[PDB]
Amino acid sequence: SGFRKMAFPSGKVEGCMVQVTCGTTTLNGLWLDDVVYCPRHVICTSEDMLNPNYEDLLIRKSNHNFLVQAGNVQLRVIGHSMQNCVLKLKVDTANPKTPKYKFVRIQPGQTFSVLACYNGSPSGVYQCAMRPNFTIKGSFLNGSCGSVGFNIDYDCVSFCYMHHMELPTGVHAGTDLEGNFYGPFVDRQTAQAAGTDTTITVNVLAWLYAAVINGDRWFLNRFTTTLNDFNLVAMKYNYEPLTQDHVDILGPLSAQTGIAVLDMCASLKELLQNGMNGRTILGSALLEDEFTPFDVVRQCSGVT
Amino acid sequence: SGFRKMAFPSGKVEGCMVQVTCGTTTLNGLWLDDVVYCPRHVICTSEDMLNPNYEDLLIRKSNHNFLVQAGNVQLRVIGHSMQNCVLKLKVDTANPKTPKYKFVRIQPGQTFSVLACYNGSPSGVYQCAMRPNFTIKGSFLNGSCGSVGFNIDYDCVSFCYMHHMELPTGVHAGTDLEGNFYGPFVDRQTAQAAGTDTTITVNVLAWLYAAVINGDRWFLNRFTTTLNDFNLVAMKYNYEPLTQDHVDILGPLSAQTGIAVLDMCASLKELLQNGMNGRTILGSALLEDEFTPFDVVRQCSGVT
Ligand SMILES: *CC(=O)c1cc(C)n(NC(=O)c2n[nH]c(=O)c3ccccc23)c1C
Ligand SMILES: *CC(=O)c1cc(C)n(NC(=O)c2n[nH]c(=O)c3ccccc23)c1C
Numbered sequence: 298s299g300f301r302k303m304a305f306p307s308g309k310v311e312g313c314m315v316q317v318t319c320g321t322t323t324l325n326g327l328w329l330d331d332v333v334y335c336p337r338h339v340i341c342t343s344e345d346m347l348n349p350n351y352e353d354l355l356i357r358k359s360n361h362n363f364l365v366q367a368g369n370v371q372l373r374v375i376g377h378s379m380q381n382c383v384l385k386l387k388v389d390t391a392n393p394k395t396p397k398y399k400f401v402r403i404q405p406g407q408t409f410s411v412l413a414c415y416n417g418s419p420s421g422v423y424q425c426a427m428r429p430n431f432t433i434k435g436s437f438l439n440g441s442c443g444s445v446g447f448n449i450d451y452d453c454v455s456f457c458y459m460h461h462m463e464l465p466t467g468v469h470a471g472t473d474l475e476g477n478f479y480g481p482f483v484d485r486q487t488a489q490a491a492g493t494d495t496t497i498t499v500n501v502l503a504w505l506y507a508a509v510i511n512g513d514r515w516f517l518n519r520f521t522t523t524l525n526d527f528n529l530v531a532m533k534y535n536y537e538p539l540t541q542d543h544v545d546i547l548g549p550l551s552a553q554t555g556i557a558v559l560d561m562c563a564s565l566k567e568l569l570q571n572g573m574n575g576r577t578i579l580g581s582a583l584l585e586d587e588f589t590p591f592d593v594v595r596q597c598s599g600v601t
Numbered sequence: 602s603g604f605r606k607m608a609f610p611s612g613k614v615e616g617c618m619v620q621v622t623c624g625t626t627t628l629n630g631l632w633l634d635d636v637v638y639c640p641r642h643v644i645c646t647s648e649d650m651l652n653p654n655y656e657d658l659l660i661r662k663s664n665h666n667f668l669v670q671a672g673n674v675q676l677r678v679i680g681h682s683m684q685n686c687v688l689k690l691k692v693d694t695a696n697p698k699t700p701k702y703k704f705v706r707i708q709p710g711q712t713f714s715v716l717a718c719y720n721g722s723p724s725g726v727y728q729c730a731m732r733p734n735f736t737i738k739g740s741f742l743n744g745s746c747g748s749v750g751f752n753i754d755y756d757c758v759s760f761c762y763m764h765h766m767e768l769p770t771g772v773h774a775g776t777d778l779e780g781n782f783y784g785p786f787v788d789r790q791t792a793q794a795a796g797t798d799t800t801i802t803v804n805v806l807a808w809l810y811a812a813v814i815n816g817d818r819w820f821l822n823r824f825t826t827t828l829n830d831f832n833l834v835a836m837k838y839n840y841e842p843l844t845q846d847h848v849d850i851l852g853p854l855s856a857q858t859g860i861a862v863l864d865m866c867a868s869l870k871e872l873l874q875n876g877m878n879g880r881t882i883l884g885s886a887l888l889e890d891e892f893t894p895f896d897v898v899r900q901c902s903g904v905t
Pocket of ligand 2: 625626627628646742743744745746747764765
């Protein structure tokens, strides 16, 4: 028993991290097969940051200007191209450690592991959620750009995120592996509105089920609610409206615990209206929304 | 910027995980050089659990009874011995993926990453603290025994923990890699008192410094305290007494932020006496104690 904010084992991704240097800038790249993917802002100087013309900046660069290093060995760049906000550096050697992989676009509310890297070297791994407003709250210092987000299913790594930006508010923004930003963000040093965020209701309910499974049950009550009534409370507390699709996704947890989804909603309604009263659930004093229903089932079943 | 509960990259440890089966029991082993380490309770049947005589149980076992599998390949066991609560299975092949490593005994209050495994296969990685009462609050289902705790310094893995037990209270207990339990625990299925736990004061202060560094400053006040006065409050709130050694360890964070350690203690005193008032610090509604001062400096400096 016990329930932790667990990241995927990072070994398969560690073997793909390389350092990319262009001019004075150094950040991380992801080496899969004979291609290295990295944020296109590696070609920017400090005078370019405010409003870079990436097309013009990239025209001044040649293959030999992109220094790609995997550990202590240099990779030979034989092509370069920009796809949206990412650069794809074709190299003459396929990464011998390329795992089975996919590039996927995750939905807001879904979770993934980030392998924080600096100079192509991994520093740590943590689990987070793609917020409903398409930002992430990560841990990214200078040099961490190009660090990637991923999920693992058996032996296949689905890369979903590449780190590009820290907004002036301190929240993080990035792209899928085809270089498309999640959210309205642009790779420019400008003030950018992230937009209203909400709490991921279905994940809070999943985590309440994980709490019951792991012995924390004080919040269970004698009440029930309806989707309509629950959603009036969700509206007041800036929670995503719960849909039947969310109820269906919570089905396996409801079956395992014997607690109807709407009964768990009634517990969540009471916690929203009355707070925790100084108590904790799974070591947290707030309602946790970074565990999907799949994350709860996976951790409660020991999937490897 | 940003601050997350970050685990070490787990790749070096993933390459050491193997499955150990003895009779009907399956758990994890750690393969380093030509030795596989695992909990000695792998030799127990359900009738042995309550009070096993490990010496007698092990005498009934031969090398060929310990099935050690690394992925799909079987390892040949050429010796076995029990050291405290661990078994050391000598195999005929050195693990080609053995990283540089050390076996260390961590102190209570220190942190480490756990690579949760089942059937020798990694499922996830998370960071936790060795509680002052020598328990850990992990995520360990049946089959997770033999999963290890570790820290990484550059390319050297210091293994500090091996998982052995879940007490009837749901907290976890285990050993160093020489098989010595942390705390008073024994590898028997009996009710075992864990003893009074405390909050790791120096880690809470470190995390308050991480909060200031990362922009969360609402808890800073116009007050100061002394070690004596702070410790009277720490006593009341079940916090470890703060010593000059703890103040010295917080020195670099105090220097970086310009906030004297005793001034940060005064903020901590006010938070203990008055609570959070519905506010959060680094996304937490409680005072976090699972980041050491070294963890804060490491994450704030991007050490790889
Ligand atoms: C996230 C990350 O690693 C990141 C963000 C930004 C803006 N950069 N680039 C720089 O910091 C940077 N870019 N171009 C230059 O010419 C620089 C000169 C000096 C220092 C930093 C520079 C990165 C890497
Ligand atoms: C932590 C862990 O992986 C763990 C804890 C305990 C007690 N075990 N062993 C068993 O569950 C177990 N041990 N011996 C047997 O003869 C068993 C028979 C059936 C099911 C489980 C058994 C492990 C592995």
